[PDB]
Amino acid sequence: QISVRGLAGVENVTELKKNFNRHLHFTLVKDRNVATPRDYYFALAHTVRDHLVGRWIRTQQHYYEKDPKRIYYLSLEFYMGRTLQNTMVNLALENACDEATYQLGLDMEELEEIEEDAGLGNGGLGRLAACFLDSMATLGLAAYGYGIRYEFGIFNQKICGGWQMEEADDWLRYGNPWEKARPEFTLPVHFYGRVEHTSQGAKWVDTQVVLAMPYDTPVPGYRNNVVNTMRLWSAKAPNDFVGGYIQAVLDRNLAENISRVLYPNDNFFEGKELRLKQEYFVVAATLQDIIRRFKSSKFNFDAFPDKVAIQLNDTHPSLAIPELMRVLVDLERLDWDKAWEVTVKTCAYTNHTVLPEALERWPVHLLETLLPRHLQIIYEINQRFLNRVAAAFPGDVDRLRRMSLVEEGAVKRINMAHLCIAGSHAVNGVARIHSEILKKTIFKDFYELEPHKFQNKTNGITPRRWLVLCNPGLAEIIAERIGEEYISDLDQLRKLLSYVDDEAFIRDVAKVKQENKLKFAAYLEREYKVHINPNSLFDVQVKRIHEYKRQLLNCLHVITLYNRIKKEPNKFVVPRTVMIGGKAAPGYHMAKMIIKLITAIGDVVNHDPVVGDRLRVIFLENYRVSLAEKVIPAADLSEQISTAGTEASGTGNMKFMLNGALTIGTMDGANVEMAEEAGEENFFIFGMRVEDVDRLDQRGYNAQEYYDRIPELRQIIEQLSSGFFSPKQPDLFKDIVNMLMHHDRFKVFADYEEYVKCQERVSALYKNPREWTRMVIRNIATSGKFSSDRTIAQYAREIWGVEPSRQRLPA
Amino acid sequence: QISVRGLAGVENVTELKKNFNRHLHFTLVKDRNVATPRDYYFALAHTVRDHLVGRWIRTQQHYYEKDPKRIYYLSLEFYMGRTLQNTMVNLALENACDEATYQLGLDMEELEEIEEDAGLGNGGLGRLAACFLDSMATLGLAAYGYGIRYEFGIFNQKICGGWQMEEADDWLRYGNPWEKARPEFTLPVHFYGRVEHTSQGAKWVDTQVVLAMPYDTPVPGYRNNVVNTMRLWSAKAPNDFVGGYIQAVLDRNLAENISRVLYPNDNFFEGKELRLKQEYFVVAATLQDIIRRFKSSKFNFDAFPDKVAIQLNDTHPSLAIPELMRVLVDLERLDWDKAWEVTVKTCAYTNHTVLPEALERWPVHLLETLLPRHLQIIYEINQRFLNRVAAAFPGDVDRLRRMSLVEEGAVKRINMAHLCIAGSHAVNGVARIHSEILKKTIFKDFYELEPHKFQNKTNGITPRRWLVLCNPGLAEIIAERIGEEYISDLDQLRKLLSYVDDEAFIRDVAKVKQENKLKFAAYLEREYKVHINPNSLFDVQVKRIHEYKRQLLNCLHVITLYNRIKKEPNKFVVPRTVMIGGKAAPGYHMAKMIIKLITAIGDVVNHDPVVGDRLRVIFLENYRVSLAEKVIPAADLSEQISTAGTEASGTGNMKFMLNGALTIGTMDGANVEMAEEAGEENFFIFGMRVEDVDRLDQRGYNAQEYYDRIPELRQIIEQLSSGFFSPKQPDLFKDIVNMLMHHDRFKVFADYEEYVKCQERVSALYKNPREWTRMVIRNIATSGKFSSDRTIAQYAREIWGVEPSRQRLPA
Ligand SMILES: OC[C@@H]1O[C@@H](OC2=Cc3c(O)cc(O)cc3O[C@H]2c2ccc(O)cc2)[C@@H](O)[C@H](O)[C@H]1O
Ligand SMILES: OC[C@@H]1O[C@@H](OC2=Cc3c(O)cc(O)cc3O[C@H]2c2ccc(O)cc2)[C@@H](O)[C@H](O)[C@H]1O
C-alpha cells in the first residue's frame, strides 16, 4: 500500500499466512472458531520473530569468529515500547504481514494495539538506551544492552477524580514472545558477608547468593541483516536455601524482589537499599558475562580494553568500576596499578543532569553492610585519585575536599559521579550547552585535572521508531521526493529545503498533519470518549511531570487564554486543544498537585459555554512510548519550556521536530542546537538564557515583584488562592500558590510575560497556514543532526574506538 | 528395536528429525555447535508435544458438539512424574523418536533423564489422581483433572550426615514444555469480607480478590487418539491493588503465595490458614469453570447432575459442597431444597485413611474470618442433616452429637468428612477391607442412615507408566506370548498361567529381572558412586516414612540378619541388598529419626568385613515417581508391612506385583485382594490380622512383654540404647527406643517374631531360583484386577453414571 513499508511478494505473503496458521494451531493450541484478537496478535508476533532467528544466530557467530571490540551499554532502564511494528519495519515485512493478515480477514493495526509496552524506563535516559540499541545494530556495532528484566515496569497511570492513581504494569501477564530465557547461563551475585585478608590478599566471604538468570531479546538493525542482543537479568533464589520449611520456601520472594519493579523516580535520587541491590545485581552479573566472553576469544588482561568498552548510562551502574577492580585484583590476581589502568581504559560515563537532587550519594554505612569489599576498593581509589590531585594542585586543600569520592557530614556518603569520573577515560554530557556547563560548574575541578576526559555527545532519536513507524504518511511524502536512503542517513532531509516553495509538497505536508490529527482525535474518542476540535492548533507538552519542566508555566498561559476570552468574548482567537501528559513519581507531592491543577483547569474551561470549542485543556492519561508514537505525529506546537540550564538535552523536542511540529522553547539543552540547525527565525524561542537565570540568582528571585507588576498574573494567582478552580475545596492549591510566590527554584513568573507574547506569535503564524507549513518544512529538513545514528557514530569513533558500518551482513 | 514400542517408519523418522531441527533453531534459538543435552531434550519434548495438538483440539471440540456428562476430578495433588516417555508410549512414537534421535547422534534415554518430575503430590493419593487421569483418557471419558499449579512440588530430599535435608523443588526453572498458559480464562476468587442479607437474600461483600490463572496440560489415552485436559490454577494478584508504591507492588507476593508450594504432609492434617486458602482457591475457580461450561451447552439447573460429576479426592476440596450451594442459592437464586438436591447428585467423596490425625477439622473461627458465607451454609447444611437423623433415629441424642458437622470443644471445628458424606450421593473407600472398616467404625452412623451411599472402589495403577514405560523388557516377553491387548485389558495377563511350566518363559522372566537389577545397580553407581551386589536378593521398602508403615519393623529385621551373621559367621545366608527410601514430612520428628536409624545401621553393617557383600542396607535418596520407575522393576521382594487396619489400600504394592517382585506383607489394604487374586500360597503373608490388633487394644499393648520373652529383640533394643549404632552420640536413638517400649500405636514388637520367620521362608524360596520365578509368574499373571482401568470403569458405572469405551477417535 505504502512504498517505505516494502513489498507484499505473492510468495512472502503465502508463507506468512502459512506460518501464522501453524503458530495459531501448534503454538497457541487454538482453532479458528475460538480464537480472540489476542491469539491473532500472538500468532503474528511468533511468525515475525521466526524471521529474526537466522540473522540473530549468524550475527552472534559472526562476532565470535571475527572477534571485534564489544560495546556493553549498562543501563538500569531500557524504555523499548512495542516490538512487533519495529521488527516488521527493520526486516522490510510490514506490507507483506499487512497483506497476509488482510487475506486472513484481519486488521494488523488492531492486532498491534494488543501488544504491551516494554515500559522498563522512566523517561529520556531510558528511551535514549532504547534508541541507542536500534542505532548500534543499524551501524553494525558488536553491541550488547545489559539491564534488569523488571517484572513490573513504570506504573500504569489512571486519572481518578482528576488525580493520578498508580496501577502495577503487569507487562508479562500474557507472556513476551520476543525474549528467549537463557536459564543455562545463570550466574551468582553476592551480597553482605565480610572481607578476610590472607596471604593471597582479600577474600569476600560469608555472602548471601542471588542468581541472575538472563533473558535475551533481539535488536534488529535497519535492513542490514544484523541482529544484536539486549540481555536483561532476572533475580532467582539459590538452589539450596523459625517458620520452618513452608516459610523458607515463601522467603525465596525476598531475593526475587530484586528484579520485581522499576524505581519510578525520574531525575531524583532515593537512597533505598533495594535500589542499591538492583544496581549491584546488573553490574555483578554483566561483568562476569563480559570477562567469560573475553577469556573465550582469539589470542593476560592488557588487551581487555582493546576488546571491551563499558558505557555507564548515568551513575546507576557506577559500581562496575570497583566491581571490575575486585575481579581483576581479588580473582585474577593483577597488581592494583595494572587493574586500574585496564578499568579506566574500559569504562566511560554519561551524565544526564546537573540538578543536585538527582546525584547518587550512597550512605557509607549501607555500602559497608551490603558491599564491604566494594567500599574498601572505593576508599583505595579515592586515596590514589586525591594523591594525583595533590601533585597537580599542591596545597589546594579545598579542591581535595570538593573532588573526594567521600562526602563528610552527619552521614558520610560516596559521590558516585566522582567515582565515575575517576574510573572512566571519558565523561560526556548529552548536548553542547550541558557538556559546557559540566566543565564550568559541577565538574570544573575534574575538567582542570583532566581536560581531554570531558566530551559532548548530543542526544538523538531513531528515525525508524520516530518517523517510519509512527508517521508512515510523512515518511512516504519524503521518500516520494528523495528516496529511502534518509531512513539511515537522516542528514539527507536537507534535500527537503529544495521543496520549501513547491506547492505540491506544501499541500502534502499539511495533508499528512491533518490525517495524523483526525487519527489522534479518533483514538481519544474510541479509548476515552473524549471529543477534540480537529480544526484547532494541537498544543502538546508530553514528558515527566517536574517543577523544572514548568508544566505550571503552560498552566499559567492556558488560564491567560481563558481569562482573555471571558474579558473580550467577541474577539477572534486561533482555536487550541492544549494537551498535557506525563507521569508523576508516586512520592512527588508537587508533581501530583500539578496533574490535579491541569484537570481542574479543564473542569472550568471545557464546560464554559462562552468558550465552547475555541479552547480545550486535556490531560493525556498514561503517557508512554506507544502513546508518544500517536500524539507526536498529531502535534502542531511542541512545548519545550524548561528553565534555561535545567534540561540537559531532551529527546521529546527532537521527536516533535522530526514529525512536523513547530517548537516553543527556552534556550536550554538540545533546543539551542535545534534552533541553530533550522535557523532561530524558524523556532519560537523565549525567556531567560542561562546567564539571565544566574543574574537573577545573584540578586535573589523575588516572585512578588512579578505578581505586583503584571495584572493578568495577579488575576490568575488570585483565582488559584480563592478557589475558582476548586470551588468545593477552595484552599486545594495553597501549596502551588505558596511555592510560586515564595519557594520557586524554577522562576516560573520571570518567564511568564515573554512566554505569553511568544504564544501570541505562534497564533499569528497559525492564521497563515501556507507560511506555518513552509516553516515546518524548514524544521523537518534540518532535523537530521538529531538522529541517534549520528550520536552513536560519535560514541564509536571518539570514546569506544570502533568504526561504524552501514554495509549489510550476507543473508 | 522392541515390538511394544511401535514402528520406526522411514517417513515418521525423517519428519521427527526435521521437526527436532526446526525446534532447535526456531524454539531454542540454538546452533548444533553450542547446543547442550538440555537443549536436545527440549527440542524432542516440543517435537513430541506437536503430535498431541490435533487430537487435543479435536477431543475437546468432540466433547463440545456431543455434550456427554463431564467428570471433574478435584485434587490438591497430581503426582504426574515425567511426561516425555508417557507421551511417546500413548501415541506409539517411542521407536520412531528413538531411531530419529539415534540418526541425529543422540541417546534418547540420556535426554529423558533431563526432564523434571511434575512432583505435585506427596504419595499414594497424589499418584492415584495421576493414574486416574491416564485411565479416564484411555476409557474415552469426558474427564478434567482440576488442581493447583504449585511453583514448588514435594521438596527434593538430600541425605547429609545420614539426615534428611529439604531443598526447594524448582521444577519450572527451565520451563514446562507440556502445559499451555490460558491467562485469557483467568477467574476471580474471593476471601474474607462479610455477608449482608438483603431482599434478594445473602450477598458476600468487602472481599479481597485473588485471580486464578489456568494452565492446561494434555492427558493422552492409550492409542485411542483421545487427549483430555489437566487444568492447574496459578494465583495472581488482582489488576488494581504505608510502605508506599514499591511496598504495594512487592505485597502482590502475599496473594501469589497461595500457589507457591505443596504442603508436604502425607496422611496428616496441619490446620494452616494458607492450606485452607489453597483448598478454597482450587474449589472456587474450578466450580466457576464447571458452571460456565454447563451454561454454554445443548438444551435450569435440574439437568446439572446429568451433565456434571464432581469427584472429591479426600476432604481437601470438600468446600466444593458449600461453594456449589453458594453459587446456586446466592447467584442463580435457586430455593435451598432444589440447590441441595442438585449438589448431592453432583458430588461424591473418596476416603483414603482411617487414621484420626489425617481428618480435616477446621477451626470455626478460621472459617468465620476467611469464608463467612461458607460457614453460614455449613451451619444450615448441618441443621437440615441432623433434622433427617432425628427423624430416622428419634431420641438418639448421642448419634446427633457423633454425626454433627460441628465438633464441640475448647476450639469448635467443622468435620470436613461429615460435610462430604452429607453433601455426596456416594462415599467410597479404596480397598474392600478399608470400605468395610468405614461401614463398621468411623462412618458406622452414616452407613445406618444411608446404606446405599457407601461403596468400595479398589485402587489401581496404570499399566502404561507401571509396566510398558518402566519395564519394556517384561512388557516385551509378555507381548511375545499373548500380544498387546493386555496393555489396555490387563485381565488378559491370566493367559500367563499357561506358561508356568514353560522353560523358555521361566528363563525370560528371570533374565528380564537380572537386566533390571544390573540397570538399577549401574544407576546407583553413576549418580551416587554406591556399589551393590547384583547377585543379592533386592529387598525394597519404598513409600513415605510413617510409624504406621513400620519402616522400623524392617529395621529390626535388618539388625536381626546382621546379629545372626556375627553369631554364626560360617553359616551360609542368601545375600541381600536391603533398600529403604521415602520422604519424611519436614516437621515429623519420629520419621526423620527413622531415616537417621536406617543410615546408622548402614554405617555399621556396610563396613563390617565379617559381613562383606552378604548384607547391604542403603537408603534410596529422593524417592519420587521417576525413581519408582527405576527401582520397582529391579525388586525381588516388596515390603508391604503396615499394621493391619492402617493402610487403606496402597498402590506401591500393586506396582511391585506387576513388575515381577514377590510380596511380604500383612493382611492390610489391597494386600488382602492381591493375595486373594494370586492365591495366598503365592504371597508371604504374616502378622496380626485386624481382629488380632483389636484383641491386643482391648487388653492393652505391653511392648515390655515382647522384649522380656525374645532374646534376639532384647539384644537389638540394647544395641539401640547403648549407642552401638551411634557410638559418638550414644543416646541418639533414645526417642525411638522410648516410643517402641512405651508409646507404640503400631505394635512393632507384636509382629517381630512372625516377620523374621516369614523372611526365613522368603530366603528359603530364593535359594530355588526356578520355583521363585514360577511363583513370580503366578503373581504377574493375576495382577490384572489392579489396573486403574478396572477402578475407573467401576467409578464411571457405579458413581458417575457414564459408560467407558476403548473405541478410538477418528484421526
Ligand atoms: O523535588 C523535591 C522533592 O520532591 C518530592 O519528593 C520526590 C522528588 C521527586 C522528584 O523531584 C522527581 C521525581 O521524578 C521523583 C521524585 O520522588 C520523590 C520521592 C519522595 C518520596 C518518596 O516516597 C519517593 C520519592 C518531595 O515530596 C520532597 O519533599 C522533595 O525533596
Ligand atoms: O504423627 C504424630 C505427629 O507427628 C509429628 O508431627 C507431624 C506429623 C506428621 C505425620 O504423622 C505424617 C506426615 O506425613 C506429616 C506430619 O507432619 C507433622 C507436622 C508437625 C509439625 C510441623 O511443622 C508440620 C507438620 C510430631 O512432631 C507431632 O508431635 C505428632 O502430633
Side-chain angles (χ1 to χ4, degrees), chain A residues 22 28 170 182 236 253, chain B residues 22 28 170 182 236 257:
Chain A
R22 189 175 62 78
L28 278 31
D170 193 19
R182 300 254 95 132
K236 141 87 174 283
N253 293 348
Chain B
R22 189 175 62 78
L28 278 31
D170 193 19
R182 300 254 95 132
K236 141 87 174 283
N257 281 342

Side-chain angles (χ1 to χ4, degrees), chain A residues 264-268 270 357 544 546-547 585 587-589 745:
Chain A
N265 312 118
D266 190 70
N267 256 282
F268 186 81
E270 188 194 355
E357 328 88 81
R544 287 296 295 266
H546 282 274
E547 285 168 279
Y588 191 181
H589 179 74
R745 296 168 54 216

Side-chain angles (χ1 to χ4, degrees), chain B residues 129-170:
Chain B
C131 284
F132 280 9
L133 258 36
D134 180 274
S135 284
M136 296 160 99
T138 295
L139 294 188
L141 267 26
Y144 306 77
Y146 273 100
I148 300 187
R149 185 176 178 268
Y150 301 111
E151 182 168 336
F152 305 99
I154 184 67
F155 62 84
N156 280 317
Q157 183 194 60
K158 315 277 145 158
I159 304 290
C160 181
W163 300 94
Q164 169 167 297
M165 304 296 293
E166 299 95 29
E167 286 205 346
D169 167 48
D170 193 19

Side-chain angles (χ1 to χ4, degrees), chain B residues 434-448:
Chain B
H434 164 61
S435 299
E436 290 304 308
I437 283 165
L438 286 187
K439 286 146 67 175
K440 279 180 214 309
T441 63
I442 54 173
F443 304 148
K444 186 164 178 297
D445 294 327
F446 295 90
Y447 173 61
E448 286 170 6

Side-chain angles (χ1 to χ4, degrees), chain A residues 392-554:
Chain A
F393 298 104
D396 191 347
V397 177
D398 207 58
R399 186 192 286 275
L400 256 24
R401 180 199 67 77
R402 304 193 298 272
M403 294 185 83
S404 180
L405 309 204
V406 185
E407 258 158 30
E408 295 306 338
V411 185
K412 267 184 54 156
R413 311 177 161 264
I414 305 304
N415 182 312
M416 305 308 270
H418 294 187
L419 172 62
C420 284
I421 298 160
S424 303
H425 68 96
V427 176
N428 79 274
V430 287
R432 189 163 60 211
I433 197 171
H434 164 61
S435 299
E436 290 304 308
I437 283 165
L438 286 187
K439 286 146 67 175
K440 279 180 214 309
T441 63
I442 54 173
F443 304 148
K444 186 164 178 297
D445 294 327
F446 295 90
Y447 173 61
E448 286 170 6
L449 211 230
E450 298 187 280
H452 285 104
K453 186 110 59 142
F454 285 85
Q455 293 193 33
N456 175 244
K457 304 287 168 279
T458 297
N459 280 348
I461 58 159
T462 179
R464 277 70 71 185
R465 189 166 297 276
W466 298 113
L467 176 53
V468 171
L469 263 78
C470 55
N471 201 354
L474 181 59
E476 193 43 35
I477 66 161
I478 299 180
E480 276 174 14
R481 310 298 192 296
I482 67 169
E484 289 186 6
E485 287 197 339
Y486 77 86
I487 296 167
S488 62
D489 187 23
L490 202 66
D491 291 308
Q492 289 200 29
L493 257 51
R494 275 189 180 283
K495 290 202 231 291
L496 255 43
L497 290 178
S498 290
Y499 294 85
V500 77
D501 300 304
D502 178 307
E503 299 309 319
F505 194 56
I506 292 168
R507 233 134 61 234
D508 283 356
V509 169
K511 190 58 141 229
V512 162
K513 185 54 63 178
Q514 173 172 238
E515 279 160 10
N516 291 342
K517 293 170 57 162
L518 288 173
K519 201 221 174 97
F520 186 72
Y523 159 89
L524 242 35
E525 195 61 69
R526 188 171 66 255
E527 295 298 301
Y528 298 105
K529 282 281 298 304
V530 167
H531 179 270
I532 56 168
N533 170 10
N535 298 143
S536 65
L537 187 155
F538 284 15
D539 173 353
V540 188
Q541 189 173 206
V542 287
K543 55 189 69 249
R544 287 296 295 266
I545 313 300
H546 282 274
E547 285 168 279
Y548 90 75
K549 280 139 141 36
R550 297 201 299 189
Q551 280 96 186
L552 270 175
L553 177 57
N554 197 166

